[PDB]
Amino acid sequence: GLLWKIPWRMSTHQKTRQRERLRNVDQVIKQLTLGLHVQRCQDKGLTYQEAMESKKKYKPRSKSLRLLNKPSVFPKENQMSSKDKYWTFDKKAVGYRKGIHKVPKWTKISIRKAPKFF
Amino acid sequence: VFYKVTLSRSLIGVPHTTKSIVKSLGLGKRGSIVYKKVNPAIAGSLAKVKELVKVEVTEHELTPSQQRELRKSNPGFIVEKR
Amino acid sequence: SQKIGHSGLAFARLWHHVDVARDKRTLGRLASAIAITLIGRHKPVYHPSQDCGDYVVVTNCQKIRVTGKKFEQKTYWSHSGRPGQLKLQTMNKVVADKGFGEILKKAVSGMLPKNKLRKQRLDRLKVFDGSENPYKQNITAFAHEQSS
Amino acid sequence: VVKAIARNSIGRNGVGAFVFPCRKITLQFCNWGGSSEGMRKFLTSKRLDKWGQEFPWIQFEVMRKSGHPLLRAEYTNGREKVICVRNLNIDNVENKLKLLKDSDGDILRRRTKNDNVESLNSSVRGIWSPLHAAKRHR
Amino acid sequence: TDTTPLKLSNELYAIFKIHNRPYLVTEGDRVILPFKLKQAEVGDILNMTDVTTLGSRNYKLVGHPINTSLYTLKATVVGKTKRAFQTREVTKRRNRRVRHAKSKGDLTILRISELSMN
RNA sequence: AGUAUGAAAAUGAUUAUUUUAUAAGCAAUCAUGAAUAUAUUAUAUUAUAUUAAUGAUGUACCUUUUGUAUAAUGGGUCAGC
RNA sequence: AGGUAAAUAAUCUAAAGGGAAACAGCCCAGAUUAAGAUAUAAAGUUCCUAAUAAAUAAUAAGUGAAAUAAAUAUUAAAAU
RNA sequence: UAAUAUUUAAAAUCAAAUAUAUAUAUAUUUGUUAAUAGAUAAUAUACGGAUCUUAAUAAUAAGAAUUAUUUAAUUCCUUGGAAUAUUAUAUUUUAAAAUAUAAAUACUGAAUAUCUAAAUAUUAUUAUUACUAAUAAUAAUAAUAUGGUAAUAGAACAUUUAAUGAUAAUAUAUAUUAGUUAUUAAUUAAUAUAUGUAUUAAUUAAAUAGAGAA
Ligand SMILES: [Mg+2]
Ligand SMILES: [Mg+2]
Ligand SMILES: [Mg+2]
Ligand SMILES: [Mg+2]
Ligand SMILES: [Mg+2]
Ligand SMILES: [Mg+2]
Ligand SMILES: [Mg+2]
Ligand SMILES: [Mg+2]
Ligand SMILES: [Mg+2]
Ligand SMILES: [Mg+2]
Ligand SMILES: [Mg+2]
Ligand SMILES: [Mg+2]
Ligand SMILES: [Mg+2]
Ligand SMILES: [Mg+2]
Ligand SMILES: [Mg+2]
Ligand SMILES: [Mg+2]
Ligand SMILES: [Mg+2]
Ligand SMILES: [Mg+2]
Ligand SMILES: [Mg+2]
């Protein structure tokens, strides 16, 4: 019909970009957590520097942040597998897999955890 | 403590809920920088749009004027009137 | 300021020489390299609105390096306007007919920018299967290089 | 033998002294004519005096003519800008005057991308040569 | 930094940067800045406090703002005039209305009066 | 279908300047040599104007459409209405 | 089925710009006007064509190099 | 270690890494085949094209432009530092060796963002000018906003007529060319043609008030 010339693989450059994006997302989360921790420290009664130093850093309480922190639910880039950085689970593909770059707004969308065996 | 939150990706193409969230966050345009007090709610909000946003924790916030001043380039000259 | 001065030497066409016997670049790479020279992209005075490229003499083109089975299998094509008159010739066949020089030339042509200047640039490139050629005298040569 | 071929020197306005580019400004107006109201006001308002005080190297003529009001300005190079200040008010007229003063007389002209400097000095370093390059080509 | 061979030469060029825009000049040149200056008026003089590189035919001093002690490079403002007026015509491909986008940007003209070693 | 006047355009011939006989496509825009013309401050290493070297960019306009370079509608050009 | 009917989101409609060779709807990004120094997005970096250097493996078919063609067969390689 | 019959797996198992008490245990995370054939139609080969797979002897020199996993020299500790190596340069010493320096921020890439100026509107601060001065006009500073069909809203200009109306052949009107003012307009200069000269400037009132689209 109408030619949408989009390849089934990604170029190395694309892959690298994807990786970078993933890393950035992780970093954002990390930063958020750090901020929360330092706020907690300040509330308790410490300085900024002191808070930064502290061995026992506080985990976040809010559900979403906690979930993000868990690597079971939301892996970090170094943890993540090759097969999940550049492919998603498609319920109706051959091999039940599909290049992430096919997913509508893949540059914004985050999607790490494919199914366990698929 | 304060978050320095930047909109690093355009809202164009992003679902309207997410757009709304971003608007609430006080982020008007791409590349726009906001300094938000750190409380859990704000953090939660940021989490939702994490893929659009670049964040970093800082000691103190900055008023827009201050930010502008910081931005300004060095005019490599000193005028003398005669 | 910088552009002001005697600019005659800049826009002088140098003759370069490449001995394909003594060059280990494979065909395509070599062609690409030559293309740049022809265009004149190597010189800082280049501007796209100007043919300012140098002359390239290729010699010993018989010893050019081609990889894989391309000598046998790589097919050059030519079509008249007339349907059914598609000529498809293998590289070896072409070589037998015209020479390795032709091969090289084709590659260079392909490389080059597709505009008026192209043909001139192509013609600047002078290729010879063996060693001997009529340009031996005019290749650029310095006085300090004369130890040999 | 050495023979001289004639030439002349080129003036560089700012290198030694600096002559001020604008020389005369003629405020032209009309008593009758609503278009010339702002100009009239300007003429009235001691602003002109102030301007004169500020910039004594440039002279202000004040003509009376029946048409629209003008600010014809005369520059060192010879050229003359002329701005018709039809229906403007005092402040706008003043702004126009300022603009006129600021400009050198030179004609307007399209600049290309990044054409900044304009010299008549031979390059300090030479023009590149293929034979005198640090790196030979191949 | 031994700055004798710059001192001794007669021809000398400088690469000063106004707002990070580099301009490469000798004495007597006219630099056309693509903006309107408010600090300087006509007839004023600017001492350049950012000069990336001073150079003779064969030697060149360099550095991120090299000391004002070493050189004297001062430009006088000659003109504040605009570059010629243009009406680029903006429109789509089956829409009769047009948006005339006018353009008459402003220029400041300098003259490099002094360019010497100190 | 009044009388004067008429350097309004389309259209024809001719002359000048310039470009053009190895080059391919809305004929423009931007870059950019060269040639010519004018200029009573070109002092010039000058400024403007004209001009299809050369390079890059560039699917006419309207209508109607989910959508038009479309091989969908409409228009030979200009002047008046 | 470039089919049809609704659901959710985006874009197009009414959106120019960069990429996808060319491209309404894809990937990024929303043109007030310039200017062009600094960050860059998606995409790329032998030449055409703006920009590249590395590391470890595998491939010898031009497979492949921006639109992956199936069962199956042959040959090899690992693991038990 | 040969032959032997399956399987193409990190679930289990092993290895490595991260988080919890911590030289261990617990929990999580990652790591398991490749070629060839099968293969195919009609204007013309069809990765967009050139073309790309490397080699001693020799290059101040090429070594994938494919596929998979990565990096921004390589290794360790926690963006940094160190070491190692490489390249380049300088100086000394006998084409080498020693010392010091630099490079390691890959780069391109939009009309994106910033910077750099300009315009407009709004919000908040000003400064100057002039007797709803709590205003207006202009200029600053900070911020936000300025794609757009159907459509809504606001503001201007050209043309012609009516009311009021100086002026003048050195004037005017129209035309051509070159200037000027952020420029559908007007104005300046030169030139040509009228004309004893504006329904002229400006404010109102109105319109047979603007045409590449029938
Ligand atoms: Mg397509
Ligand atoms: Mg349409
Ligand atoms: Mg149109
Ligand atoms: Mg189209
Ligand atoms: Mg017709
Ligand atoms: Mg349908
Ligand atoms: Mg419609
Ligand atoms: Mg578009
Ligand atoms: Mg929209
Ligand atoms: Mg916009
Ligand atoms: Mg192939
Ligand atoms: Mg294919
Ligand atoms: Mg075919
Ligand atoms: Mg390709
Ligand atoms: Mg912008
Ligand atoms: Mg608008
Ligand atoms: Mg009508
Ligand atoms: Mg008409
Ligand atoms: Mg029209």
PDB file of C-alpha atoms (C1' of nucleotides) in Angstrom, chain H:
ATOM      1  C1'   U H   1      40.359 -39.118  25.026  1.00  0.00           C
ATOM      2  C1'   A H   2      37.623 -41.463  20.481  1.00  0.00           C
ATOM      3  C1'   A H   3      32.951 -42.989  19.050  1.00  0.00           C
ATOM      4  C1'   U H   4      27.881 -42.603  20.635  1.00  0.00           C
ATOM      5  C1'   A H   5      22.013 -40.248  20.889  1.00  0.00           C
ATOM      6  C1'   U H   6      19.495 -36.006  21.931  1.00  0.00           C
ATOM      7  C1'   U H   7      19.078 -30.529  22.985  1.00  0.00           C
ATOM      8  C1'   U H   8      19.926 -25.181  20.969  1.00  0.00           C
ATOM      9  C1'   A H   9      18.204 -24.149  27.500  1.00  0.00           C
ATOM     10  C1'   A H  10      20.462 -19.130  32.689  1.00  0.00           C
ATOM     11  C1'   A H  11      13.560 -22.193  34.208  1.00  0.00           C
ATOM     12  C1'   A H  12      17.007 -25.473  36.912  1.00  0.00           C
ATOM     13  C1'   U H  13      22.171 -25.301  37.335  1.00  0.00           C
ATOM     14  C1'   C H  14      27.052 -22.407  37.338  1.00  0.00           C
ATOM     15  C1'   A H  15      29.427 -17.575  36.798  1.00  0.00           C
ATOM     16  C1'   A H  16      29.252 -12.407  37.435  1.00  0.00           C
ATOM     17  C1'   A H  17      26.842  -7.929  39.380  1.00  0.00           C
ATOM     18  C1'   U H  18      23.397  -4.879  42.798  1.00  0.00           C
ATOM     19  C1'   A H  19      20.444  -4.328  47.307  1.00  0.00           C
ATOM     20  C1'   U H  20      19.515  -6.097  52.612  1.00  0.00           C
ATOM     21  C1'   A H  21      22.302  -8.406  58.097  1.00  0.00           C
ATOM     22  C1'   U H  22      27.282  -9.049  55.842  1.00  0.00           C
ATOM     23  C1'   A H  23      34.510 -12.695  54.217  1.00  0.00           C
ATOM     24  C1'   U H  24      28.469 -15.820  54.705  1.00  0.00           C
ATOM     25  C1'   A H  25      23.152 -15.915  53.987  1.00  0.00           C
ATOM     26  C1'   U H  26      18.827 -13.847  51.812  1.00  0.00           C
ATOM     27  C1'   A H  27      16.422 -11.232  47.619  1.00  0.00           C
ATOM     28  C1'   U H  28      16.884  -9.280  42.718  1.00  0.00           C
ATOM     29  C1'   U H  29      19.406  -8.615  38.018  1.00  0.00           C
ATOM     30  C1'   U H  30      22.336 -10.344  33.488  1.00  0.00           C
ATOM     31  C1'   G H  31      24.978 -14.178  30.616  1.00  0.00           C
ATOM     32  C1'   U H  32      23.204 -20.337  25.967  1.00  0.00           C
ATOM     33  C1'   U H  33      24.348 -21.329  17.703  1.00  0.00           C
ATOM     34  C1'   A H  34      26.110 -19.957  12.464  1.00  0.00           C
ATOM     35  C1'   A H  35      26.194 -20.683   7.200  1.00  0.00           C
ATOM     36  C1'   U H  36      24.034 -22.511   2.337  1.00  0.00           C
ATOM     37  C1'   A H  37      19.839 -23.986  -0.374  1.00  0.00           C
ATOM     38  C1'   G H  38      14.602 -23.499  -0.508  1.00  0.00           C
ATOM     39  C1'   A H  39      14.472 -17.751  -3.501  1.00  0.00           C
ATOM     40  C1'   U H  40      10.946 -16.895  -9.208  1.00  0.00           C
ATOM     41  C1'   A H  41       8.144 -12.654 -15.216  1.00  0.00           C
ATOM     42  C1'   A H  42       7.676  -9.520 -18.317  1.00  0.00           C
ATOM     43  C1'   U H  43      10.591  -1.028 -20.594  1.00  0.00           C
ATOM     44  C1'   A H  44      16.533  -1.496 -17.088  1.00  0.00           C
ATOM     45  C1'   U H  45      21.209  -3.698 -13.075  1.00  0.00           C
ATOM     46  C1'   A H  46      18.111  -1.610  -8.552  1.00  0.00           C
ATOM     47  C1'   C H  47      21.829  -1.353  -0.712  1.00  0.00           C
ATOM     48  C1'   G H  48      19.153   5.954  -3.381  1.00  0.00           C
ATOM     49  C1'   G H  49      24.091   5.531  -6.217  1.00  0.00           C
ATOM     50  C1'   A H  50      29.580   4.913  -6.240  1.00  0.00           C
ATOM     51  C1'   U H  51      30.910   1.083  -3.938  1.00  0.00           C
ATOM     52  C1'   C H  52      32.260  -1.924   0.745  1.00  0.00           C
ATOM     53  C1'   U H  53      34.980  -8.233   2.990  1.00  0.00           C
ATOM     54  C1'   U H  54      42.751  -6.775   2.749  1.00  0.00           C
ATOM     55  C1'   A H  55      48.089  -8.522   1.874  1.00  0.00           C
ATOM     56  C1'   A H  56      53.718 -10.557   3.635  1.00  0.00           C
ATOM     57  C1'   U H  57      57.833  -7.973   0.810  1.00  0.00           C
ATOM     58  C1'   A H  58      57.545  -1.474   2.190  1.00  0.00           C
ATOM     59  C1'   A H  59      55.195   2.802   2.676  1.00  0.00           C
ATOM     60  C1'   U H  60      55.520   9.742   8.537  1.00  0.00           C
ATOM     61  C1'   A H  61      49.814   5.596   5.340  1.00  0.00           C
ATOM     62  C1'   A H  62      44.919   1.032   3.870  1.00  0.00           C
ATOM     63  C1'   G H  63      42.840  -3.466   7.344  1.00  0.00           C
ATOM     64  C1'   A H  64      34.203  -3.591   6.563  1.00  0.00           C
ATOM     65  C1'   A H  65      30.897   0.790   4.385  1.00  0.00           C
ATOM     66  C1'   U H  66      28.029  -6.287   7.114  1.00  0.00           C
ATOM     67  C1'   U H  67      26.019  -8.665  11.595  1.00  0.00           C
ATOM     68  C1'   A H  68      25.976  -8.839  17.567  1.00  0.00           C
ATOM     69  C1'   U H  69      27.664  -6.514  22.307  1.00  0.00           C
ATOM     70  C1'   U H  70      30.063  -1.982  23.770  1.00  0.00           C
ATOM     71  C1'   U H  71      33.352   2.701  24.559  1.00  0.00           C
ATOM     72  C1'   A H  72      34.566   7.819  23.642  1.00  0.00           C
ATOM     73  C1'   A H  73      42.295   6.055  24.580  1.00  0.00           C
ATOM     74  C1'   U H  74      43.032   1.060  28.324  1.00  0.00           C
ATOM     75  C1'   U H  75      42.823  -0.526  33.534  1.00  0.00           C
ATOM     76  C1'   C H  76      41.550   0.261  38.725  1.00  0.00           C
ATOM     77  C1'   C H  77      39.212   2.811  43.004  1.00  0.00           C
ATOM     78  C1'   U H  78      34.943   6.298  44.178  1.00  0.00           C
ATOM     79  C1'   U H  79      31.523  13.252  38.001  1.00  0.00           C
ATOM     80  C1'   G H  80      36.606  12.749  40.043  1.00  0.00           C
ATOM     81  C1'   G H  81      41.664  10.879  40.773  1.00  0.00           C
ATOM     82  C1'   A H  82      45.496   7.539  39.771  1.00  0.00           C
ATOM     83  C1'   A H  83      48.307   4.439  36.873  1.00  0.00           C
ATOM     84  C1'   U H  84      49.327   2.479  31.867  1.00  0.00           C
ATOM     85  C1'   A H  85      49.540   3.240  26.970  1.00  0.00           C
ATOM     86  C1'   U H  86      49.193   6.116  22.455  1.00  0.00           C
ATOM     87  C1'   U H  87      49.835  10.677  19.471  1.00  0.00           C
ATOM     88  C1'   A H  88      51.745  15.520  18.949  1.00  0.00           C
ATOM     89  C1'   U H  89      55.181  19.216  20.452  1.00  0.00           C
ATOM     90  C1'   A H  90      59.189  21.387  22.841  1.00  0.00           C
ATOM     91  C1'   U H  91      64.277  20.910  25.435  1.00  0.00           C
ATOM     92  C1'   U H  92      68.485  18.310  26.646  1.00  0.00           C
ATOM     93  C1'   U H  93      71.640  14.082  25.798  1.00  0.00           C
ATOM     94  C1'   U H  94      73.998   9.942  22.375  1.00  0.00           C
ATOM     95  C1'   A H  95      68.038   8.418  13.843  1.00  0.00           C
ATOM     96  C1'   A H  96      67.417   6.949  19.294  1.00  0.00           C
ATOM     97  C1'   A H  97      67.105   7.780  25.107  1.00  0.00           C
ATOM     98  C1'   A H  98      65.628  11.183  29.239  1.00  0.00           C
ATOM     99  C1'   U H  99      62.560  15.548  31.023  1.00  0.00           C
ATOM    100  C1'   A H 100      58.218  18.716  30.618  1.00  0.00           C
ATOM    101  C1'   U H 101      53.797  20.165  28.245  1.00  0.00           C
ATOM    102  C1'   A H 102      48.972  19.155  25.784  1.00  0.00           C
ATOM    103  C1'   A H 103      45.181  15.929  24.066  1.00  0.00           C
ATOM    104  C1'   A H 104      41.794  12.879  26.159  1.00  0.00           C
ATOM    105  C1'   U H 105      35.644  17.487  27.252  1.00  0.00           C
ATOM    106  C1'   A H 106      34.305  12.396  19.870  1.00  0.00           C
ATOM    107  C1'   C H 107      31.719  15.163  15.925  1.00  0.00           C
ATOM    108  C1'   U H 108      27.472  16.739  12.539  1.00  0.00           C
ATOM    109  C1'   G H 109      22.827  17.832  13.047  1.00  0.00           C
ATOM    110  C1'   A H 110      16.494  21.698  13.151  1.00  0.00           C
ATOM    111  C1'   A H 111      13.046  27.887  11.849  1.00  0.00           C
ATOM    112  C1'   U H 112      14.345  23.327  19.242  1.00  0.00           C
ATOM    113  C1'   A H 113      16.742  25.963  23.816  1.00  0.00           C
ATOM    114  C1'   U H 114      20.397  29.702  25.267  1.00  0.00           C
ATOM    115  C1'   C H 115      23.266  33.940  23.880  1.00  0.00           C
ATOM    116  C1'   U H 116      23.030  38.231  20.651  1.00  0.00           C
ATOM    117  C1'   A H 117      19.860  42.429  19.006  1.00  0.00           C
ATOM    118  C1'   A H 118      14.535  44.198  16.951  1.00  0.00           C
ATOM    119  C1'   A H 119       8.922  44.273  17.077  1.00  0.00           C
ATOM    120  C1'   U H 120       4.257  43.622  19.282  1.00  0.00           C
ATOM    121  C1'   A H 121       0.735  42.297  23.778  1.00  0.00           C
ATOM    122  C1'   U H 122       0.200  41.410  28.926  1.00  0.00           C
ATOM    123  C1'   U H 123       1.974  41.200  34.268  1.00  0.00           C
ATOM    124  C1'   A H 124       5.389  43.496  37.741  1.00  0.00           C
ATOM    125  C1'   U H 125       9.266  47.254  38.547  1.00  0.00           C
ATOM    126  C1'   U H 126      11.450  51.896  36.785  1.00  0.00           C
ATOM    127  C1'   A H 127      13.548  56.675  33.938  1.00  0.00           C
ATOM    128  C1'   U H 128      12.484  60.977  30.862  1.00  0.00           C
ATOM    129  C1'   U H 129       8.899  64.293  28.719  1.00  0.00           C
ATOM    130  C1'   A H 130       3.959  67.136  29.147  1.00  0.00           C
ATOM    131  C1'   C H 131      -0.672  70.354  33.829  1.00  0.00           C
ATOM    132  C1'   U H 132      -8.759  59.043  34.731  1.00  0.00           C
ATOM    133  C1'   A H 133      -0.329  62.994  36.205  1.00  0.00           C
ATOM    134  C1'   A H 134      -3.822  57.027  39.987  1.00  0.00           C
ATOM    135  C1'   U H 135      -2.874  59.840  32.697  1.00  0.00           C
ATOM    136  C1'   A H 136      -0.550  59.768  28.067  1.00  0.00           C
ATOM    137  C1'   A H 137       3.690  59.476  24.971  1.00  0.00           C
ATOM    138  C1'   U H 138       8.764  57.318  24.571  1.00  0.00           C
ATOM    139  C1'   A H 139      12.726  54.533  26.641  1.00  0.00           C
ATOM    140  C1'   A H 140      14.644  50.622  30.151  1.00  0.00           C
ATOM    141  C1'   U H 141      14.833  45.895  33.380  1.00  0.00           C
ATOM    142  C1'   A H 142      12.601  40.747  34.555  1.00  0.00           C
ATOM    143  C1'   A H 143       9.067  37.435  33.006  1.00  0.00           C
ATOM    144  C1'   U H 144       5.289  35.013  29.939  1.00  0.00           C
ATOM    145  C1'   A H 145       3.204  34.840  25.127  1.00  0.00           C
ATOM    146  C1'   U H 146       3.381  35.717  19.394  1.00  0.00           C
ATOM    147  C1'   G H 147       2.044  28.252  13.155  1.00  0.00           C
ATOM    148  C1'   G H 148      -2.644  28.249  11.715  1.00  0.00           C
ATOM    149  C1'   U H 149      -7.933  26.208   7.722  1.00  0.00           C
ATOM    150  C1'   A H 150     -13.465  27.021   9.235  1.00  0.00           C
ATOM    151  C1'   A H 151     -14.398  30.785  12.713  1.00  0.00           C
ATOM    152  C1'   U H 152     -14.319  35.038  16.619  1.00  0.00           C
ATOM    153  C1'   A H 153     -12.016  39.657  18.230  1.00  0.00           C
ATOM    154  C1'   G H 154      -8.973  44.206  17.734  1.00  0.00           C
ATOM    155  C1'   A H 155      -6.042  48.031  14.671  1.00  0.00           C
ATOM    156  C1'   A H 156      -4.472  50.358  10.359  1.00  0.00           C
ATOM    157  C1'   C H 157      -3.571  51.801   4.922  1.00  0.00           C
ATOM    158  C1'   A H 158      -5.039  52.831  -0.526  1.00  0.00           C
ATOM    159  C1'   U H 159      -9.203  54.827  -3.699  1.00  0.00           C
ATOM    160  C1'   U H 160     -13.667  58.257  -4.361  1.00  0.00           C
ATOM    161  C1'   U H 161     -17.375  61.681  -2.733  1.00  0.00           C
ATOM    162  C1'   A H 162     -19.345  65.833   1.332  1.00  0.00           C
ATOM    163  C1'   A H 163     -18.369  69.241   5.575  1.00  0.00           C
ATOM    164  C1'   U H 164     -14.011  72.687   7.500  1.00  0.00           C
ATOM    165  C1'   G H 165      -9.290  74.460   4.816  1.00  0.00           C
ATOM    166  C1'   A H 166      -3.646  77.691   4.512  1.00  0.00           C
ATOM    167  C1'   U H 167      -0.529  77.513   0.511  1.00  0.00           C
ATOM    168  C1'   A H 168       1.971  78.078  -4.691  1.00  0.00           C
ATOM    169  C1'   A H 169       5.072  77.785 -11.985  1.00  0.00           C
ATOM    170  C1'   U H 170      11.413  77.691  -6.593  1.00  0.00           C
ATOM    171  C1'   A H 171       4.328  75.305  -6.905  1.00  0.00           C
ATOM    172  C1'   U H 172       1.542  70.940  -8.109  1.00  0.00           C
ATOM    173  C1'   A H 173      -0.342  66.446 -10.294  1.00  0.00           C
ATOM    174  C1'   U H 174       1.069  61.941 -12.839  1.00  0.00           C
ATOM    175  C1'   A H 175       4.794  58.946 -14.656  1.00  0.00           C
ATOM    176  C1'   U H 176      10.354  56.505 -14.895  1.00  0.00           C
ATOM    177  C1'   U H 177      14.901  55.677 -12.348  1.00  0.00           C
ATOM    178  C1'   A H 178      17.905  55.824  -8.102  1.00  0.00           C
ATOM    179  C1'   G H 179      17.668  56.631  -2.735  1.00  0.00           C
ATOM    180  C1'   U H 180      15.037  57.149   2.576  1.00  0.00           C
ATOM    181  C1'   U H 181      11.553  55.521   6.754  1.00  0.00           C
ATOM    182  C1'   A H 182      10.501  48.001   9.996  1.00  0.00           C
ATOM    183  C1'   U H 183       8.039  50.152   3.711  1.00  0.00           C
ATOM    184  C1'   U H 184      -0.031  47.098   0.491  1.00  0.00           C
ATOM    185  C1'   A H 185       2.229  53.543   2.088  1.00  0.00           C
ATOM    186  C1'   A H 186       4.553  57.851   2.022  1.00  0.00           C
ATOM    187  C1'   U H 187       8.643  60.743   1.153  1.00  0.00           C
ATOM    188  C1'   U H 188      13.684  62.587  -1.119  1.00  0.00           C
ATOM    189  C1'   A H 189      16.678  63.756  -5.849  1.00  0.00           C
ATOM    190  C1'   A H 190      17.015  63.825 -11.071  1.00  0.00           C
ATOM    191  C1'   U H 191      14.276  63.495 -15.369  1.00  0.00           C
ATOM    192  C1'   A H 192       9.467  64.108 -18.821  1.00  0.00           C
ATOM    193  C1'   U H 193       4.528  65.971 -19.453  1.00  0.00           C
ATOM    194  C1'   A H 194       0.610  68.851 -17.728  1.00  0.00           C
ATOM    195  C1'   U H 195      -1.721  72.755 -15.057  1.00  0.00           C
ATOM    196  C1'   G H 196      -2.129  79.901 -13.093  1.00  0.00           C
ATOM    197  C1'   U H 197      -2.939  75.495 -10.014  1.00  0.00           C
ATOM    198  C1'   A H 198      -5.124  70.747  -5.039  1.00  0.00           C
ATOM    199  C1'   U H 199     -12.243  68.831  -2.051  1.00  0.00           C
ATOM    200  C1'   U H 200      -4.367  69.475  -0.854  1.00  0.00           C
ATOM    201  C1'   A H 201      -2.496  68.426   5.366  1.00  0.00           C
ATOM    202  C1'   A H 202      -5.724  66.881   9.272  1.00  0.00           C
ATOM    203  C1'   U H 203     -10.527  65.551  11.823  1.00  0.00           C
ATOM    204  C1'   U H 204     -15.256  63.837  10.759  1.00  0.00           C
ATOM    205  C1'   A H 205     -19.167  61.767   7.672  1.00  0.00           C
ATOM    206  C1'   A H 206     -20.027  58.173   4.026  1.00  0.00           C
ATOM    207  C1'   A H 207     -19.163  54.712   0.110  1.00  0.00           C
ATOM    208  C1'   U H 208     -20.651  51.589  -7.005  1.00  0.00           C
ATOM    209  C1'   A H 209     -13.956  51.588  -1.264  1.00  0.00           C
ATOM    210  C1'   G H 210      -9.179  47.381  -3.110  1.00  0.00           C
ATOM    211  C1'   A H 211      -9.710  41.239  -7.940  1.00  0.00           C
ATOM    212  C1'   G H 212      -5.113  35.741 -11.013  1.00  0.00           C
ATOM    213  C1'   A H 213      -9.545  33.031  -9.850  1.00  0.00           C
ATOM    214  C1'   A H 214     -17.281  32.719 -11.471  1.00  0.00           C
TER     215        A H 214
END
